[PDB]
Curated annotation (Swiss-Prot), chain A:
Keywords attached to this entry: Cobalt, Lyase, Metal-binding, Oxidation
Protein name in the entry: Cobalt-containing nitrile hydratase subunit alpha
GO BP terms in the entry: nitrile catabolic process
GO molecular function (one): cobalt ion binding
Primary enzyme class: lyase
Stated family: Belongs to the nitrile hydratase subunit alpha family.
Cofactor remark: Binds 1 Co(2+) ion per heterodimer.
Record organism: Pseudonocardia thermophila
Cofactor(s), by name: Co(2+)
Reaction catalysis annotation: an aliphatic primary amide = an aliphatic nitrile + H2O
Subunit structure: Heterotetramer of two alpha and two beta chains.
Biotech and industrial use: Industrial production of acrylamide is now being developed using some of these enzymes.
Curated annotation (Swiss-Prot), chain B:
Reported temperature dependence: Optimum temperature is 60 degrees Celsius.
EC number of the protein: 4.2.1.84
Reported biotechnological use: Industrial production of acrylamide is now being developed using some of these enzymes.
Protein's recorded name: Cobalt-containing nitrile hydratase subunit beta
GO terms for biological process, alphabetical: nitrile catabolic process
UniProt key word Nucleotide-binding: no
Species of origin: Pseudonocardia thermophila
GO molecular function, one term: nitrile hydratase activity
Subunit record text: Heterotetramer of two alpha and two beta chains.
């Protein structure tokens, strides 16, 4: 939104860059931060940990009833079956979308998100607009922002992760996918479908 | 604290800004800011709860419109000063130095295998907040409870929109680090954790969606029994 008091994005970026490089120089001199540590962390979340991991869990649940039961019983233990877990995903509780219920996740108090299965969250999820409105007008937000219309008769359960428990949505399997392979099914699972702001891809 | 950051239910924040796609890191400084998390954590600057409290104490106007990772930088500086691990005056001098010389080199330093080990361990091993306590859970699934109306001035996970509201316990997750003590440097003091369901009508009154409910996690001290 417009703010007549705010500097340009260019000036803001230039100032932040200087402040960060300065703090970085100090932490480095203290011996607690190094360039390799910086590169390793960035490498992990730019190429290793992402929503493709969550997609693997979803497709297994879609094609394995028993795994699905385990996933819904204890998300953390179930995901470990696929070697998935870790930082900010130590405690996961998966919630299943049905014809009667739709789930949507948010972290109103900050920006908590299940990194192990979804990677780092997109900026809109961490920002004030989505966080403030989703617990108050979830139905209208889904329609207006994501073009996702959820029938008035269908209950919308909004999960506000105020603790370390991370909530992940198991979207319904799209129709017309009978017998599809896990790899083929995965093409329909999106980061958005696991946050609940969108259903899995149709067709 | 009753900070502006506690945005759940706030009106007037505007439409969501969502590009079709975006990079994980929009600029190099974001990568640095991100990596500083495990670095300062390992160095004892703060724990996760304190980390959040530092961000909650930001200038609200700055918090609402500044790039996300800038919040992280603010909390690092906050705790760096708090613990005396960061000299503000020196930080200011260096900031000006890098403003005038953006391409100046960083300090010479040796790489440390222990730091990479820490990163890999924390990422794939995680930092579990679950703990065992000697007391049994006070509540159980089905219990009708009321969220406390306390308003701590320090860190807590008591969203203003749920305070004083009545809901139903959906699940007991066991005990976990308690924010009200941890985020204020008072220790883990683990408490049983429960997910509680609040109808939209209960939270927002008539303006609430007739067919919606919000699930919110409550540590034991946050709730009191209404009906078993």
């Amino acid at each position: 939104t417009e703010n007549i008091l705010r500097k340009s994005d260019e000036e803001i970026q230039k100032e932040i860059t200087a402040r960060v490089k300065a703090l970085e120089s100090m932490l480095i001199e203290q011996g607690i931060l190094t360039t390799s540590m910086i590169d390793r962390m960035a490498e992990i979340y730019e190429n290793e940990v992402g929503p493709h991991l969550g997609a693997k869990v979803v497709v297994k649940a879609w094609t394995d009833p028993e795994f699905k039961k385990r996933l819904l019983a204890d998300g953390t233990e179930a995901c470990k079956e696929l070697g998935i877990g870790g930082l900010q995903g130590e405690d996961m509780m998966w919630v299943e979308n049905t014809d009667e219920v739709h789930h949507v996740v948010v972290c109103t108090l900050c920006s908590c998100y299940p990194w192990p299965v979804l990677g780092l969250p997109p900026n809109w999820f961490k920002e004030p607009q989505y966080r403030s409105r989703v617990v108050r007008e979830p139905r209208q937000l889904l329609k207006e922002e994501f073009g996702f219309e959820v029938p008035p008769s269908k209950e919308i359960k909004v999960w506000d992760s105020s603790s370390e428990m991370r909530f992940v949505v198991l979207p319904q399997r799209p129709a017309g996918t009978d017998g599809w392979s896990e790899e083929e099914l995965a093409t329909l699972v999106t980061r958005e479908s696991m946050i609940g702001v969108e259903p899995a891809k149709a067709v | 604290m009753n900070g502006v950051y506690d945005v759940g239910g706030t009106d007037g924040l505007g439409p969501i800004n969502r590009p079709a796609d975006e990079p994980v890191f929009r600029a190099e400084w974001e990568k640095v800011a991100f990596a500083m998390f495990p670095a300062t954590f390992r160095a004892g600057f703060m724990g996760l709860d304190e980390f959040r409290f530092g961000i909650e104490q930001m200038n609200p106007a700055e918090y609402l419109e500044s790039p996300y990772y800038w919040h992280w930088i603010r909390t690092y500086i906050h705790h760096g000063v708090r613990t005396g691990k960061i000299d503000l005056e020196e930080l200011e001098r260096r900031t000006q130095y890098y403003r005038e010389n953006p391409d100046a080199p960083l300090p010479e330093h040796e790489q440390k295998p222990e730091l990479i080990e820490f990163v890999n361990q924390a990422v794939y091993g995680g930092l579990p907040a679950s703990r065992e306590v000697d007391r049994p859970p006070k509540f159980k699934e089905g219990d009708v409870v009321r969220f406390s109306t306390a308003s701590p001035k320090g860190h807590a996970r008591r969203a203003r929109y749920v305070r004083g509201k009545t809901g139903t316990v959906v699940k007991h997750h066991g005990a976990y680090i308690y924010p009200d003590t941890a985020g204020n440097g008072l220790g883990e003091c683990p408490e049983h954790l429960y997910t509680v369901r609040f109808t939209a009508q209960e939270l927002w009154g008539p303006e609430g969606d007739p067919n919606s409910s919000v699930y919110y996690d409550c540590w034991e001290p946050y709730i009191e029994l209404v009906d078993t």
